[PDB]
Amino acid sequence: NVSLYKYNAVHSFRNITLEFGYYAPLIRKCQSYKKKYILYYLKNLDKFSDIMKVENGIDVVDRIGGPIEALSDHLEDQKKERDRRLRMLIDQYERNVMMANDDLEDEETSFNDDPIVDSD
Amino acid sequence: SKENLPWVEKYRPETLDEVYGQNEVITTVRKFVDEGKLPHLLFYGPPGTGKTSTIVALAREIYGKNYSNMVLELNASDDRGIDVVRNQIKDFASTRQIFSKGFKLIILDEADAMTNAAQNALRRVIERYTKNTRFCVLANYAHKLTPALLSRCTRFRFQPLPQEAIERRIANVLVHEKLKLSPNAEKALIELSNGDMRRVLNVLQSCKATLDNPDEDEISDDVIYECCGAPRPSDLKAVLKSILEDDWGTAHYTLNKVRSAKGLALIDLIEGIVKILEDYELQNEETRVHLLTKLADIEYSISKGGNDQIQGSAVIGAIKASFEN
Amino acid sequence: MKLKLIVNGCEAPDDYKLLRTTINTVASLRKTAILRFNSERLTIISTPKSSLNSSNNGTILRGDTGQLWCTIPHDVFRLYTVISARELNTITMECNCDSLLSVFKRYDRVMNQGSSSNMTIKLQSMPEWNPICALGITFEEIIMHSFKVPVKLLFRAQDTRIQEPMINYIQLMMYKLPPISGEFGSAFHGFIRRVERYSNVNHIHLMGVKKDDVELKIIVNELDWHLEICWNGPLDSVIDISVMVEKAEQESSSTHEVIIRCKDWKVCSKLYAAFEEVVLAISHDESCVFHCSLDRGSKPRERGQIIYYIARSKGL
Amino acid sequence: MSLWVDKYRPKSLNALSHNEELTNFLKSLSDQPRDLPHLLLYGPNGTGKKTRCMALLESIFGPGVYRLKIDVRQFVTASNRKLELNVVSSPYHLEITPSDMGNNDRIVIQELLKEVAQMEQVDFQDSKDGLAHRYKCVIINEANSLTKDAQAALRRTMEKYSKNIRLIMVCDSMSPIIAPIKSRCLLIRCPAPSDSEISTILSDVVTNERIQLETKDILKRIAQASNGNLRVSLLMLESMALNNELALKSSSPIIKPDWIIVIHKLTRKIVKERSVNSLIECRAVLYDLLAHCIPANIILKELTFSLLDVETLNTTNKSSIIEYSSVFDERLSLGNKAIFHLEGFIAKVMCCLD
Amino acid sequence: EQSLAQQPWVEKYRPKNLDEVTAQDHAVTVLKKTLKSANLPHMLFYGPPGTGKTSTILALTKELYGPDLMKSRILELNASDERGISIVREKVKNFARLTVSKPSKHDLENYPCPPYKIIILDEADSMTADAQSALRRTMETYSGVTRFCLICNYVTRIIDPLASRCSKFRFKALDASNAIDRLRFISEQENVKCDDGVLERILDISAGDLRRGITLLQSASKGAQYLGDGKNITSTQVEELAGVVPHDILIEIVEKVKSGDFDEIKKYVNTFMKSGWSAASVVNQLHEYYITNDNFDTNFKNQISWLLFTTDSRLNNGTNEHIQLLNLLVKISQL
Numbered sequence A: 001n002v003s004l005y006k007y008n009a010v011h012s013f014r015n016i017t018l019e020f021g022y023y024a025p026l027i028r029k030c031q032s033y034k035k036k037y038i039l040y041y042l043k044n045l046d047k048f049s050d051i052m053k054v055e056n057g058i059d060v061v062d063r064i065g066g067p068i069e070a071l072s073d074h075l076e077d078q079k080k081e082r083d084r085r086l087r088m089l090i091d092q093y094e095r096n097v098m099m100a101n102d103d104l105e106d107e108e109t110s111f112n113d114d115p116i117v118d119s120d
Numbered sequence B: 001s002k003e004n005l006p007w008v009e010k011y012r013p014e015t016l017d018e019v020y021g022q023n024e025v026i027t028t029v030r031k032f033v034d035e036g037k038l039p040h041l042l043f044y045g046p047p048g049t050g051k052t053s054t055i056v057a058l059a060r061e062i063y064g065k066n067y068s069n070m071v072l073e074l075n076a077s078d079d080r081g082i083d084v085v086r087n088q089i090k091d092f093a094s095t096r097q098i099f100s101k102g103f104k105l106i107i108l109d110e111a112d113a114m115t116n117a118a119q120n121a122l123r124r125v126i127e128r129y130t131k132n133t134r135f136c137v138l139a140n141y142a143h144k145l146t147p148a149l150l151s152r153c154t155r156f157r158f159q160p161l162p163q164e165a166i167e168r169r170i171a172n173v174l175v176h177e178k179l180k181l182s183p184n185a186e187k188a189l190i191e192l193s194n195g196d197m198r199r200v201l202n203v204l205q206s207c208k209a210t211l212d213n214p215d216e217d218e219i220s221d222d223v224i225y226e227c228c229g230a231p232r233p234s235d236l237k238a239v240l241k242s243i244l245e246d247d248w249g250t251a252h253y254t255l256n257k258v259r260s261a262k263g264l265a266l267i268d269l270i271e272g273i274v275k276i277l278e279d280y281e282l283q284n285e286e287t288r289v290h291l292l293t294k295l296a297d298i299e300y301s302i303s304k305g306g307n308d309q310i311q312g313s314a315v316i317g318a319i320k321a322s323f324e325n
Numbered sequence C: 001m002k003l004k005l006i007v008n009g010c011e012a013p014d015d016y017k018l019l020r021t022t023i024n025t026v027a028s029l030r031k032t033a034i035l036r037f038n039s040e041r042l043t044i045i046s047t048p049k050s051s052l053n054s055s056n057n058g059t060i061l062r063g064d065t066g067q068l069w070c071t072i073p074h075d076v077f078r079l080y081t082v083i084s085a086r087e088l089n090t091i092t093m094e095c096n097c098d099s100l101l102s103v104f105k106r107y108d109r110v111m112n113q114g115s116s117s118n119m120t121i122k123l124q125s126m127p128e129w130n131p132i133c134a135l136g137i138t139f140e141e142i143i144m145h146s147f148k149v150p151v152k153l154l155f156r157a158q159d160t161r162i163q164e165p166m167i168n169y170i171q172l173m174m175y176k177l178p179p180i181s182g183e184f185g186s187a188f189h190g191f192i193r194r195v196e197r198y199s200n201v202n203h204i205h206l207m208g209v210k211k212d213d214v215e216l217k218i219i220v221n222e223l224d225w226h227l228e229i230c231w232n233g234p235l236d237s238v239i240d241i242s243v244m245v246e247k248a249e250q251e252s253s254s255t256h257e258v259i260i261r262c263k264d265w266k267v268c269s270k271l272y273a274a275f276e277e278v279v280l281a282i283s284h285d286e287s288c289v290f291h292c293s294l295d296r297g298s299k300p301r302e303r304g305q306i307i308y309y310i311a312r313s314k315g316l
Numbered sequence D: 001m002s003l004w005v006d007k008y009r010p011k012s013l014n015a016l017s018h019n020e021e022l023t024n025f026l027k028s029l030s031d032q033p034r035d036l037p038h039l040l041l042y043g044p045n046g047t048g049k050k051t052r053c054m055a056l057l058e059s060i061f062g063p064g065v066y067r068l069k070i071d072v073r074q075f076v077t078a079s080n081r082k083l084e085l086n087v088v089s090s091p092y093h094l095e096i097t098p099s100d101m102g103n104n105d106r107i108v109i110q111e112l113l114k115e116v117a118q119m120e121q122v123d124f125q126d127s128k129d130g131l132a133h134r135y136k137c138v139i140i141n142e143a144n145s146l147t148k149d150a151q152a153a154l155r156r157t158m159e160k161y162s163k164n165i166r167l168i169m170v171c172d173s174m175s176p177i178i179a180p181i182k183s184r185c186l187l188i189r190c191p192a193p194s195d196s197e198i199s200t201i202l203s204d205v206v207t208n209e210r211i212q213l214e215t216k217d218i219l220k221r222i223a224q225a226s227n228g229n230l231r232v233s234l235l236m237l238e239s240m241a242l243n244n245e246l247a248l249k250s251s252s253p254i255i256k257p258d259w260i261i262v263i264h265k266l267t268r269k270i271v272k273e274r275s276v277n278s279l280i281e282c283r284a285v286l287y288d289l290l291a292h293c294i295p296a297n298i299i300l301k302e303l304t305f306s307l308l309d310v311e312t313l314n315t316t317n318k319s320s321i322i323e324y325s326s327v328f329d330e331r332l333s334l335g336n337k338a339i340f341h342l343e344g345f346i347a348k349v350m351c352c353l354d
Numbered sequence E: 001e002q003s004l005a006q007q008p009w010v011e012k013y014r015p016k017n018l019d020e021v022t023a024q025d026h027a028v029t030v031l032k033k034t035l036k037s038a039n040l041p042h043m044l045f046y047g048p049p050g051t052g053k054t055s056t057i058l059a060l061t062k063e064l065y066g067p068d069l070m071k072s073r074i075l076e077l078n079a080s081d082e083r084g085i086s087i088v089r090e091k092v093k094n095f096a097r098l099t100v101s102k103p104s105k106h107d108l109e110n111y112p113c114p115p116y117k118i119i120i121l122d123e124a125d126s127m128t129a130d131a132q133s134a135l136r137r138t139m140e141t142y143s144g145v146t147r148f149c150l151i152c153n154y155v156t157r158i159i160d161p162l163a164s165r166c167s168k169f170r171f172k173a174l175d176a177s178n179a180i181d182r183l184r185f186i187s188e189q190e191n192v193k194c195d196d197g198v199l200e201r202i203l204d205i206s207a208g209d210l211r212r213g214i215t216l217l218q219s220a221s222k223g224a225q226y227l228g229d230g231k232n233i234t235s236t237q238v239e240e241l242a243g244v245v246p247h248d249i250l251i252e253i254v255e256k257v258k259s260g261d262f263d264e265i266k267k268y269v270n271t272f273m274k275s276g277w278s279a280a281s282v283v284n285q286l287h288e289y290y291i292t293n294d295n296f297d298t299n300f301k302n303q304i305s306w307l308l309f310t311t312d313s314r315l316n317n318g319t320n321e322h323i324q325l326l327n328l329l330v331k332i333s334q335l
C-alpha cells in the first residue's frame, strides 16, 4: 500500500518475500540516517535531493517479518496500523488529482497572458 | 417414438424374458414373484449388465402396466439425504397400497451414492415395514454400502454378459433393423464389449451409421475398427514382433508407422499388447513382474497426458528390458 | 476571465428548477462535471472522457458510457457577464459536483424558509492553493453566507476534445412520451418504474413497433420466466484497435430495439419526472437518447435542452 | 524518491536496451494489434517481462497505460467465507494476481474475469457516427501459480469471448501450465540479460546518480552475484551505494538477500556435522525460513545448488544430492506440507555424505 | 475489412459446418448421417488438445437447429461454470425435462429440427465423480427429448457408468499428414508466403495440435509483414518462434553429457537456464536425438528411454525445471 500510494509502483507478493522485503527497508533506513545527519549538520551549520524525501512515520525501514535469526492480539493491532497508514496514504493522494494532472503539453504561457480579474 | 431413441434405450428389455445372461438370478426372481415371496433384494454388478432393466421388468410383472403407481424409484439424480429417508421413503413405506395390490416396492438405484447417515436410517425402515413393503438396492461398488444394509438384503450378482447372450441379443437387433453383421465383426464386437451390452449397442448403431447403404451393405470387422478407431489384431502382433525381435530403430519406425497409418492411440496398443502377453508362456517370473510394473506406470502417466513419443519409447524399452532378463 | 452571474429563484421558477435538476443529475451520474460558459448559454456536461472522470476508469470496469448534456440559456441568470478571449468568449471549467450540489441544497433550504435573496457567483484566485481557482458564491439569509468551491480551468485543446455525441438521425426512431402533467403522466411514470420491482434484473430490452400509431415495450429475460411489459395508452411518434460495433439485422423495417442497463432507465425516469416534454429516440441495437425540452417564449426564446445518451448494454 | 528499480523503468519499446530480437518481435506484434492473440510470456524471474508487457500495451494504446489505480473486489465462497482481491486497473487494461487467493483463485476466474469478458466495451465515437468497440487487455501475474481448476476455467472464457478480451499471462516456468492453456496462447520466451548489458545499465544508473565508481569491475561483480536478475542487481547497487557514502570501491562488500546467506550457513552446517541433532537444528532453520513466507520449492532449489557448490564433496555425493533433490521436488509438488519433504531431503543428504 | 481482421486466426478460421472439420471423418460421417436418421445418441468426445471437439459439436448444433432454434434447444456448460452436484441435480435435470420447443415454419422448412434438445458438458473431465454419478439416470430417463454430449481430454476421468452410457468418439491427433490441407488453405487465404516444407515443420512442431500450428503461422506472418522485405518465411524463423532449442545448443549439451564431468555439466546447465528454454522442449529434443541415434547400444537406449519417461512425468507434475534437467543430464552422463 505504501509503495502504491507514494511511488506509483506495483510489486508482487512473491517479489516482496524474495527481494524487496529485505532490500527496501535497508535502503530506507540508510536514507533516513543520511537525512537525519544532514538535518543535524544544517542545524549546527540539492545533490541528495532524493534522500530527505523519506517520511519517518510513513516509510517502512524495518525488515518485513523481522530478522532471520536462524544461524544469526498482535495481528489485530498490525491490521489496525495498516488501515490507519492506508487512510493517510489515501488522504495524501486524494488532493493530488484535483491539485494538478499531466494531461498534455499546451500553451501554458498564453493562459497566464489572460489572468482572472475580480473586482466590483 | 421408439425409432428416434438411441439403441441403448430403444432395446431396453420390457419383460424378464428379454433379459439374457442372468439365467439363475432371473429364474429365482421369476419364481419368487410366482410364489409371491419376494425378499429385500440387492443387485450387485458392473455397468450395463441388466440390473435396472431386470428390476423394472420385475416391477412390471408384479404390478402389470400400472407399476408406476405403487413403485417408488429413487436414484443418484435425486436427493436422498437423511431427511429424505425420514420423510418421503418412510411415509411411502408406511402407507397402504393403492388398491391393496399386495406389497409396495421401493427401488434405490445406485444406492452406493447414498450417504452413511441415510443408509443407517434405512435399516429400521426396511425392518419394520417388511410386511407392507420390499426394498431393492442396486450397486456397482459394495464397499460404499454399510454392513448392516448388506446384511439386510438378499444378494444377487450380475456377472459380465456371457458371449452367447450377447450373440442372441445381437441377432435380435439385426432382425429388428435391416442390418447384416459378419462373423468376424461379431467376434470383434464381443471382444471389445467386455461384457457390457451398452457398448455393443452403441458400436452397432455407429457401424450402421457408417454404412453408405445399410439396406444392403454388410458390417465387417474393418467397419467396427474404423468406428471405434481401435487397433487391429494384426497391428498389435506386428508391433509386438518388432519390439521383441528387431532393433531399437526398427521398432521405433514400426510403432510410428503403425500408429500413423490409422491414427491409433498408444493406450489402446498398450492394452492389446498386455492382453497378448497375458497368454505368453514365460520361463522367468521376474519378467512378468517388470512388465506389469512398468506398463502400469506408463498407463498411469498416459492418463495424465504428457509426451506421446517419450511414452511410446518407454513402452518399447520396458518390454525389451523385461524380456532381457 | 470575469464570470459574474446572478441567480434568482423567485423569477422564472422553471429556469431554477431546470438548473437544479441538471446539477442533481450530473452529481448523481459522476463525481465531476464540466461547465462551459459561452457568450450565449451555459453547458453542463457529464462525460467519462473528462480529465477528472477518466481517472476512475469507469468505462473499462463498469461500462460507464452514458453522456449527459444540459444547455441553459443566458436568460436564466439575471446578470450574465461572461467576457473571454476565446471563440465566442467560451470559458471551460471542471468542477466537483458534491460541493455545488451541497451549496444549491442550502440555497433551496434558505429559499423554502422564505427568503427572496439572490445568489452571486464569481471566479476568484484563492491564494491558499491548469491553475486551480475558486467559485465564490454569496447570498443573503434573512447574514452574508459565502461559500467557495475549487475549480480547474481547461485549455482550448482540452476544451475541443469534449464533443457531444452525434447520432444517425435518419436511422433513428423518435417517440413523443405523454406529458407528466397530463392525465397519462402517472400511468407512464409507473410503467417506467415497473421493472424496478425486480431487484435482480440488470438489463432491460426496450422495443418500439409501429401500430396513436406506435407501441413501446420493455422485455426482461433475466428471470426464470420471460417477462414483457406493454404500454397500451396513447403515444405519438415524432416525424488504434477501435472497430465498429456489430448491429443485428432488423426484424422488420418498423421495429427498433435496444438493450440498456437499469441504472440508465432510472436516470431516464428521473428526467421524465423532472421535465414536461420528453422524447425517447432509439437507434436499433445502437443507443437510446432521452431528450427533455423546456419551452419558453416572450420572439420565441431559446429552448432549454437536456440530452442523455445511453449506449447499448448488450448486443442483440 | 522511488527505488532505482522503478525510477529508471523503461516506458516504451524503443527504450529497451537488451534482447533486441525480443524487442523487434514485440514491435511486430504491435503493427496490427487488431488480431493480437493471447500471449504467454515465460522467462527467468526479474528479467523484464512485466516491463515488456507494459511497453507493448503503451505502444498499442499510449502512455496512459502507466496511470494505474487500485480497487478491492470482494468475493464470497460457498461456506460464506468473505475475502478480497486487489485489482490494478488502467483506462485501457486490467491487472490481477489470482494466485493471491490460493485455492480460491478459480473463483476469481469464474466470477470476475468471466464478467470482464462478457461486458463488451463500447464508446461513443468523437467524430464518426455510431459506437466504437475495443477489446480489453487483462494481465495475469504469476500464471504458473494458478490451480488446475482455474486454468481449466480460463479455457472457454479465452475462446468464446476473444472479441472482448485478450489475455497476457506472465510466468517463470511453463511446467505447471496445463497443455490446453499453452495451446491457446502465443508463447514468448524472455531470455535474461547478459552480464555486459546488466553492467551497462548499472553504469548508466551510476552516471545518472553521480556515484563515484573506482572501476567498472564492481558492476560486473554485482551482475555475477545477481545471477541474471536485473531487479536484484539494481537493488544491491542502491544498497551498496548508500552504505558506502555513494562512493563504491573494490573492497565494498556485495550485499545478498539475508535468506540466501542463511541457506549458505545451513549448507555449511549440513556438510560439517551429520547427526540427528544436526537434523533438528536444520529443521529449526527451515522453519525460520518458512516463517518469512519463502516458498518451499525455492528453499529446496537454493539449498540443493548451494550444496552442489561445496568443493569437498565428490561426484557420487553430488549425484546423490541431485537425485534426492529431484525426488523431493516432485514430492513437494504432489504434497501438502513442505516440512516433511525438506526434512527428508536433508536427512537423505546427511546419510549420503556420512 | 477491419472488422473481419479483428480476430485471432484460430477463432477466425474455426470451422463453420461439419464439412470444414478435417481428419476426424470416422465420427463426422456418423454425425452427418444423424442429420437424416434423427437418431443422435449420447456422445462422449475425447482427445488431445486442439483436435476439433468443441468446433465439431458447435457445427453439429448449428446444422441441426439453426441460429434461432438453437437458443432454445442447446444448454452449454463448461469449466468456467459452476457444476457441483446441486447444479447437476437441479439445473441440468430441469433442462433435460423441458418440453421440446415448437419450431417455426421457417425453421422447419430450412433445418431438420430434430425433436430433442442437446446438453453439452465441455471439459467434463473437471467434474467430480459424485456430480458425474448424478447424471446417470437423468441421461437415460429423458433420452426421448434430450441428448447429452460430454467432451474431455482425459477419458479416464469420466466414471465408467457414464462412459458406458455414452457412445464414444476419439478425436485423432492432427499432424503433417492429415491436417496439412487445412493449414495450407488458411495460409492461402491470408497470402502467407512460406518456403516449401514450412507448413509441415509447423505441424510437426505442434505435435497433434492444430490450434498451436495456426497460432505459430499467424506469428510468422506478423513477423514477415512487419519486416516487409517480400521474402518467404523460413523454417529457422518458425523454430525460433516455437521455442525450439537451436541444434548447436543441443549438440553442446550432448558433448557436455558425453564428457561426464559433473561440475562442467552443472555450470553449463546454470548458464543454459538463463535463456529461459522450456524443459519439456529440451527433453523432447534429447529424446529425438538419442533414441534415433545409431551410435548407441540397446541397453543404453532402454535405460535412457526409462530416464526420459521418468523426467517427463516429473515435469508434467509441475516441478522445478532446472533441478529435473540437471538430474536427467547427470543420469545420462553416468550411463
Ligand SMILES: Nc1ncnc2c1ncn2[C@@H]1O[C@H](COP(=O)(O)OP(=O)(O)OP(O)(O)=S)[C@@H](O)[C@H]1O
Pocket: B007, B008, B009, B011, B012, B013, B018, B019, B020, B021, B022, B045, B046, B047, B048, B049, B050, B051, B052, B053, B054, B139, B140, B169, B197, B198, B201, E161, E164
Ligand atoms: N441382460 C441384458 N439383456 C439385454 N439387454 C441388456 C442387458 N443388460 C443390459 N442390456 C442393455 O443395456 C441397457 C442398459 O442396461 P441397464 O440395466 O440399465 O444397465 P445397468 O445394469 O443398470 O448398469 P448400471 O449399474 O446402471 S451403469 C439396456 O437398456 C439394454 O439395452
Ligand SMILES: Nc1ncnc2c1ncn2[C@@H]1O[C@H](COP(=O)(O)OP(=O)(O)OP(O)(O)=S)[C@@H](O)[C@H]1O
Pocket: D155, D179, D180, D183, E009, E010, E011, E013, E014, E015, E020, E021, E022, E023, E024, E047, E048, E049, E050, E051, E052, E053, E054, E055, E056, E152, E153, E174, E182, E210, E211, E214
Ligand atoms: N479438426 C479441425 N479442423 C479444423 N480446424 C481445427 C480442427 N481442430 C482444431 N482446429 C482449429 O483449432 C481451433 C480450436 O479447436 P477446438 O475444437 O476448440 O479444439 P479442442 O479439441 O476443443 O481443444 P481442447 O480439447 O478444448 S484443448 C479451431 O477454432 C480451429 O481453428
Ligand SMILES: Nc1ncnc2c1ncn2[C@@H]1O[C@H](COP(=O)(O)OP(=O)(O)O)[C@@H](O)[C@H]1O
Pocket: D004, D005, D006, D008, D009, D010, D015, D016, D017, D018, D044, D045, D046, D047, D048, D049, D050, D051, D052, D201, D230, D231
Ligand atoms: N531494458 C531495460 N533497461 C533498464 N532496466 C530494465 C530493462 N528491462 C528490465 N529492467 C528492469 O528490471 C526490473 C524488473 O523487471 P520486471 O519486468 O519486474 O521483471 P519480471 O520479468 O520478473 O516481471 C525493472 O524494475 C526494470 O527497471
Ligand SMILES: [Mg+2]
Pocket: B051, B052, B053, B109, B138
Ligand atoms: Mg442401472
Ligand SMILES: [Mg+2]
Pocket: E053, E054, E055, E122
Ligand atoms: Mg474444446
